[PDB]
Structure formats: C-alpha cells, structure tokens
Design a protein around this ligand. Structure first.
Ligand code: NA
Ligand code: NA
Length: 274
C-alpha cells in the first residue's frame, strides 16, 4: 500500500583531469525510473522505466536543468569540503546525497528525508521535523550554520510536503500496472549432502518484486533463526529479485524441516519441504 520516491546523487572529484562527475538515479520503490550522468555522451539523462517515457518535453527539459544546476552546486560543495577538512587539492573525494518522500496507502506524506555523506561517512542530515539538521561532525557544523541562515530546511519542507508527494502519486498512477503489482516469488527447495551424515536444504525465491521478502526455516515448527544462512537479496537484472535461505540437517531428518516464504505478492505465506 505504501510507497516511496528516492533520489541518489553521487559527485566524484578528479582534480586536474576534469570537473567532478555528477551521477543521479531516481527510484519509485525498488524501480529505477531515471539516470543523469554528466559524463555520458548523448543523451545525459535517460529514462529507465516505460511509464516515465510517457512524460513530455517540458517535463524532461525541466529535470535536465535541475540536474545541470545540481552538478554545478556539487562542484562548489566538493571545493568547500576539501577546505573544511584541510585536505590536499590532489586527492579524489566523493559527495553523496539521498532524499525523497514516503507516503501511505492514502498517498499522504508519512515522512521526508534528505541526507548527505562525504567520503562514505554521514556528513549532514535533515531531521524528520524537516526544520533542523544533524551535523555528523565538527566540519558539518559549518554547513549547518550556512543552511540555517539560508533557511534551507524550509525549502526542503515545501518540496517534501508538496511536489515530492504530488509527483510520487502521479508516477504511481501512470506506472500502476507495474509499480502497484507485486510479483510473487517462484520457489523451490534443493538438497546438497555435505557428508553422509549432514545435508544442506536450500529454499529459493526467484523473480519477485518488490525486494522485501522473508525466508525462514523451521524444524517441527520451531524457527531456526540462529542456524539459518541467508544470502543477500540480489537483482536478477529484469527488475525482479532473488534470495535463498539454507539450513544444515542430519541426514534422514529432512522431513522435520519446512521453509516459509512471506512476500507482498503472496496473500498467504508458502510452506515448502524437501
Ligand atoms: Na512543493
Ligand atoms: Na512459489
């Protein structure tokens, strides 16, 4: 029922080679819908989902200019940051930002987000109040003061409560056939002896969307929390996801074990066995 829009910006300096590279990607839930890359050839902003290709040239040009303005801003930021940390003019550095809005099933704002990081560590974050900042270190207190003076949080609040939510609603409607349809997992259980007295049971989930999923193993109905091995959820490359969970069991006791699969695309969870 609930949904999110999120942007992910990365700016990477390369002093003496060129201006910093700026790349942005945007998502609705777990679906990417846009990329901008200052280093790409032609064109620099590309659509990544079909429902976005429905938008017209005014929309595209508007977004393009926002990306171009941000790339310039990020160049100033990276310069300022090397000063803040008394760094050499020679090393490469990375500035990241992640922002967006979460809405409930009624399309109403649940909460907004904006966060930045420098060289992979938290730098400054908008608090959930959309009115104040958390500086992660002493240097980020510089930005905090500058942004307080500029009433930067007020601009964020206006965006997060307004256009962020409005546009997310629009994308969800235009993209409803995919964005609002959960694809349940395709499942199976496999068996792999590790010796003649123990064997691995592996419970698979393939082809599911969104990425959130819960795979568990039980022995006679008791959860095997501490003895289940999970791989990280991984992308299939076609917008769907994959995961597996494994337990190692005494040979000949396989019948005691059940795999349980919970996913938004499954009205009732699945129970699977070897
Ligand atoms: Na707004
Ligand atoms: Na299945």
């Amino acid at each position: 029922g609930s949904h999110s829009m999120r942007y992910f910006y990365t700016a990477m300096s390369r002093p003496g080679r060129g201006e910093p590279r700026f790349i942005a990607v945007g998502y609705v839930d777990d679906t990417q819908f846009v990329r901008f890359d200052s280093d790409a050839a032609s064109p620099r902003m590309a659509p990544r989902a079909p429902w976005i290709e429905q938008e017209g040239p005014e929309y595209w040009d508007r977004e393009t200019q926002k990306y171009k303005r941000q790339a310039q801003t990020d160049r100033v930021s990276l310069r300022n940051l090397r000063g803040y940390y008394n760094q050499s003019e020679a090393g490469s550095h990375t500035l990241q930002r992640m922002y967006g809005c979460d809405v409930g099933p009624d399309g109403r704002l649940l909460r907004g987000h904006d966060q930045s990081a420098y060289d992979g560590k938290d730098y400054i974050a908008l608090n959930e109040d959309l009115s104040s900042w958390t500086a992660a270190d002493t240097a980020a207190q510089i930005t905090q003061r500058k942004w307080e003076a500029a009433r930067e949080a007020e601009q964020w609040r206006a965006y997060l409560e307004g256009l962020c939510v409005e546009w997310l609603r629009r994308y969800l409607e235009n993209g409803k056939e995919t964005l609002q349809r959960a694809d349940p997992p395709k499942t199976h259980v496999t068996h792999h002896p590790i010796s003649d007295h123990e064997a691995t049971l592996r419970c698979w989930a393939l082809g599911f969307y969104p990425a959130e999923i819960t795979l568990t193993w039980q022995r006679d109905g008791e959860d095997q929390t501490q003895d289940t091995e999970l791989v990280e959820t991984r992308p299939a490359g076609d917008r769907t996801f994959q995961k597996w969970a494994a337990v190692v069991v005494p040979s000949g006791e396989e019948q005691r074990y059940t795999c349980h699969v919970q996913h938004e695309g499954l009205p009732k969870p699945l129970t699977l066995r070897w």
